[PDB]
Amino acid sequence: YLMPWDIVIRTRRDDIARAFVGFEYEDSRGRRFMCSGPDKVMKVMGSGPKESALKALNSDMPLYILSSSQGRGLKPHYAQLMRLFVVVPDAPLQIILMPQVQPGPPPCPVFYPEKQEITLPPDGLWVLRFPYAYVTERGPCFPPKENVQLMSYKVLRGVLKAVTQ
């Protein structure tokens, strides 16, 4: 599922446009799930998601989360944030995408696409695919080892901005 993002157009059902957002994690076995915040795997039982996207958009989303399966092995399985889903409504607003990723603790650099600000066209279900591996001039930013604080591996808050026209 994707989280509802209710955007106010004018400071009636006509004053609020509804977008949808989903942060997709993928594990090494190809299992996929959406998160509704840093420590919360989204689970919908019944008539759709109750959780607002505004919480996830205003928080740093972790690049790695523990996969919800106990494998028959001693090693923790991480799922990586691989995709961002965005439903842009047909409404007088601009949705701007600004993806920034920090794949490790400071002084680790921040990675971003070659186009830093991307205005998404109206009436569209869009998917941004994040890099699988991150590499600097000093070499690769390796995935977290056993005993590393996952909070240092993150997609920075503010990945999406809405601007009313």
Residue 153 and residue 103 in contact, taking contact as beta carbons nearer than 8 Å: yes
Cβ atoms within 10 Å, residue 139: 7
User: Per the structure block, which two tokens stand in for 48?
Assistant: 């759709």
From CA 28, how far away is CA 35, in angstroms rounded? 17
Q: 4 pairs with which residues across the strands?
A: 20
The amino acid at 144? P
User: Per the structure block, which two tokens stand in for 51?
Assistant: 């959780």
From CA 122, how far away is CA 115, in angstroms rounded? 19
Method: cryo-EM
From CA 147, how far away is CA 62, in angstroms rounded? 16
From CA 112, how far away is CA 102, in angstroms rounded? 9
Residue 21 and residue 160 in contact, taking contact as beta carbons nearer than 8 Å: yes
Distance from the Cα of residue 80 to its chain's centroid = 10
Residue 97 and residue 118 in contact, taking contact as beta carbons nearer than 8 Å: yes
User: Per the structure block, which two tokens stand in for 116?
Assistant: 């830093």
CB under 8 Å to 30, separation ≥6 — which residues? none
Could you tell me if residue 46 is left (phi over 0), alpha (psi between -120 and 50 degrees) or otherwise beta? left
CB under 8 Å to 27, separation ≥6 — which residues? 67, 69, 77, 78, 79, 80
Q: Which resolution, in Å, applies to this structure?
A: 3.4
User: Per the structure block, which two tokens stand in for 145?
Assistant: 């080892």
Q: 126 pairs with which residues across the strands?
A: 86
Please report, for residues 20, 60, 69, 131, the alpha-carbon distance to residue 120 in angstroms, rounded to integers and kept in the order given.
13, 21, 35, 20
Q: 38 pairs with which residues across the strands?
A: none
Secondary structure element (H or E) that encloses residue 154, with its range = strand 153-155
The amino acid at 106? P
Task: Name which of 125, 124, 120 is nearest 162 in CA terms.
Answer: 120
The amino acid at 4? P
The DSSP code sequence of 46-73 is: SSS--S-HHHHHTSPEESEEE-S---SS
Task: Name which of 40, 35, 26 is nearest 1 in CA terms.
Answer: 35
Question: Cα angle at 148 between 133 and 22, to 5 degrees?
Answer: 55
Q: 64 pairs with which residues across the strands?
A: 80
